[PDB]
């Protein structure tokens with residue numbers, strides 16, 4: 084069980100013990116948000132057309 | 137010295153932020169008015185605590201933090217509470233109308249109108265850093281804002297700060313305190329959209345925290361205040377290495393290096409011991425060996441699952457208090473001969489160990505007893521994938537009937553995004569099986 | 574934040590007035606509009622239903638509508654009648670003669686614009702309007718026909734706000750005219766399209782409760798409306814008091830309504846009062862789920878629950894509440910659909926209603942509600958196959974075709990409920 088890389092300071096210590104070896108761009112984001120907003124506009128216009136009938 | 141900026145999104149994220157920053161103030165000796173008498177360098181410095189606190193010429197120590205919510209009622213409590221003087225007003229951002237538990241309303245409809253303002257305030261904080269490391273992001277999986285706005289934000293932070301590390305702290309949904317049926321939809325949609333943008337994510341299951349509070353603190357019916365105080369102890373254990381002198385996990389990149397060799401499998405399991413009640417008359421104190429043993433009991437884990445039936449990829453033990461290396465190594469030698477700890481073949485069998493000599497702090501008049509020594513274990517084990525299975529099963533049950541889907545479509549989401557997210561989850565479960573069995 | 578309330582016609586205005594009496598008493602507001610309570614919990618969310626006027630006066634955010642004056646004179650003379658804003662009374666003179674077509678197409682159309690002006694003035698001064706609630710009956714002419722006309726115009730001018738109704742459904746057991754089934758079929762067709770939530774209040778059930786359980790040989794409208802007002806108080810408690818929850822009408826709707834057309838809820842209340850024995854939590858739980866406490870005359874064992882909300886009021890053990898709610902779900906699991914996990918939700922408010930130590934209100938989205946619509950459909954068909962009494966309607970310009978379409982819409986709603994009941 085090998086103990087390696089001990090480090091020490093006034094606030095503590097650390098070490099390791101071994102027991103055994105072995106993106107989208109801004110434009111695309113903007114487009115997606117605008118496509119969703121357009122779909123919402125379309126549904127709203129269909130509702131208001133129903134109401135005018 | 138390198139700065140760290142925290143972002144708290146939605147109700148759960150804001151309230152957990154409150155608990156964490158209260159505890160950090162007690163640990164560093166900062167008063168609610170922001171003064172720090174032990175700090176002899178007035179108006180600046182590159183001490184370790186400066187990673188998390190800036191300084192004014194008047195000696196005020198100011199959190200590097202942004203709070204964001206789409207309705208105002210939770211952040212107003214911060215504005216009027218005990219620590220109101222700690223935070224600059226431009227740090228506290230609110231909208232008028234919330235996402236009503238609907239991922240699509242958070243991500244598309246409302247997020248589109250506040251995202252630029254939020255990025256501007258973040259930029260304001262970034263311009264004060266001389267060597268910005270990255271971000272710590274706190275949110276729920278289940279809320280409309282915590283899921284949908286957070287995923288939008290993560291995409292934009294990847295665009296605007298492409299070199300920087302990003303860590304998550306995520307609240308996984310539990311029916312014992314949950315208030316909505318659609319939380320599985322929101323959890324899958326946000327995990328899918330965020331997965332490439334997050335370097336390392338610590339999941340906390342509300343069911344585990346609830347049961348720990350009932351069993352070990354003798355609380356008949358835990359509230360959010362109890363839950364958040366315990367969670368804040370665990371978060372503090374994780375960030376102490378960023379806030380104090382030391383040689384392990386001293387920057388955000390080291391979390392990935394030590395815990396995540398496969399980039400998609402970046403969800404480490406946390407285990408914390410001991411949790412002891414303040415009302416319990418006398419407590420016989422637990423030795424290093426006993427608390428290190430408690431790390432292998434499922435009842436102490438942040439997600440209920442069974443590590444005996446998976447494989448380890450990495451392991452870290454973070455001790456606080458009266459602990460020397462000799463006792464750690466003796467405990468580990470004992471534990472190896474008694475428990476089922478099997479690593480994958482391409483990784484070494486081993487523990488990286490950190491010790492901070494200052495014992496844990498507790499909140500006066502709280503439910504937690506002061507102890508002389510405690511430990512947090514961070515292990516990357518495939519058994520955590522059990523939680524994905526549970527969530528995915530619930531998703532499949534509802535989506536087969538299209539229950540509640542119209543609420544999401546009416547906000548402009550297409551039905552296809554549901555099945556893209558679900559198939560990405562199917563591939564994730566497959567990755568964990570191929571690695572683990 | 575702010576809710577706008579509307580009450581239309583005789584039934585709507587009587588139950589509306591009773592509602593405002595009960596909740597004004599709970600918030601410590603007297604008939605003059607002065608606050609005389611003992612606790613800041615009464616005022617912290619008072620603004621949801623009341624505007625503040627000069628002199629620390631609280632005025633209901635309420636609009637009062639009818640095509641004849643009589644009932645609004647009775648409101649104005651009623652015990653709390655002075656608390657309503659005078660400018661919010663909007664009434665015609667002609668009447669609507671229990672005729673949906675008069676309410677919707679002729680007499681009602683003349684008045685609707687002046688009603689919308691007052692709605693707009695109330696909304697304009699709201700900090701953040703969450704939406705609307707309407708009280709009305711479906712069996713008459715004004716509440717039924719003009720109420721559904723109003724609903725349509727409000728959707729057209731405020732399309733993204735929640736529209737909620739409390740709707741009293743007719744019964745031959747408590748009947749004013751023979752044409753009630755025509756007026757109800759025409760109205761349901763509108764509600765299916767234009768509301769987010771409709772509470773089905775059946776005069777059959779209210780009568781049976783007064784007769785069998787509360788022991789009253791001759792129930793009046795007053796006795797029925799007492800139960801209605803207590804139920805409505807129960808159902809608005811979670812918005813009205815500081816009970817941890819961060820909710821608005823939209824989040825509640827998102828939690829309760831899995832498919833847009835299936836939004837008709839079955840209310841209940843416990844304990845039923847007309848005593849002194851306090852009531853254990855097991856007893857509240859058993860009674861709130863009992864068929865006999867339901868306000869729509871439907872057997873819940875004849876269908877399945879899509880969703881359930883339970884609201885408990887009073888000082889009690891949350892542990893015991895959880896245990897009892899879990900007990901009923903685990904022992905009766907077959908009546909709850911397996912493909913919506915965790916579909917039963919529970920709220921607790923510390924403040925009890927007047928005259929009770931402990932109480933429970935029930936809201937169910939059950940497929941058994943199809944029984945109510947089938948009832949109405951049969952009564953409709955029995956007349957419509959012989960065209961009986963149709964001349965009252967065609968004389969106001971309606972064609973037979975519109976009746977056929979309304980009948981078809983309601984048979985489709987029934988078929989949908991059956992589809993989800995067999996799944």
Ligand SMILES: Nc1nc2c(ncn2[C@@H]2O[C@H](COP(=O)(O)OP(=O)(O)OP(=O)(O)O)[C@@H](O)[C@H]2O)c(=O)[nH]1
Pocket residue numbers: 145146147148149151152206234235236237238276278279280281282283307308309310313314315319342360363364819
């Ligand atoms: N641990 C913990 N969980 C919380 C807390 N507050 C809310 N939650 C959980 O978060 C989930 C709901 O998410 P919220 O944070 O309330 O929703 P939101 O992000 O504000 O989004 P909105 O729907 O727009 O209000 C549920 O599972 C809650 O149990 C908290 O203070 N602590």
Ligand SMILES: Nc1nc2c(ncn2[C@@H]2O[C@H](COP(=O)(O)OP(=O)(O)O)[C@@H](O)[C@H]2O)c(=O)[nH]1
Pocket residue numbers: 581582583584585587588669670671672710711712713714715716717741742743744747748749753776794795797798
């Ligand atoms: N529960 C209840 N039902 C009523 C009341 N007044 C009338 N009704 C019922 O409502 C229907 C009559 O409608 P009504 O309100 O009188 O017509 P309107 O004035 O034209 O809107 C019939 O089914 C009556 O039995 C009431 O105060 N309470």
Ligand SMILES: Nc1nc(NCc2ccc3c(c2)OCO3)cc(-c2cccc3[nH]ccc23)n1
Pocket residue numbers: 315316706737770808809810811812813818824825826828829882884918919920936
């Ligand atoms: N849909 C729905 N449910 C209700 N019940 C209670 C509940 C508590 C906690 C919940 C929950 C529901 O859903 C998830 O968490 C009341 C209401 C309502 C209707 C109409 C007018 C109203 N004014 C105030 C309230 C309200 N509307």
Ligand SMILES: [Ca+2]
Pocket residue numbers: 175176177178179180181183191
């Ligand atoms: Ca300094």
Ligand SMILES: [Ca+2]
Pocket residue numbers: 683
């Ligand atoms: Ca005329």
Ligand SMILES: [Cl-]
Pocket residue numbers: 296297
């Ligand atoms: Cl940069």
Ligand SMILES: [Mg+2]
Pocket residue numbers: 146147207234279281819
């Ligand atoms: Mg919220």
Ligand SMILES: [Mg+2]
Pocket residue numbers: 583713749
């Ligand atoms: Mg009448």
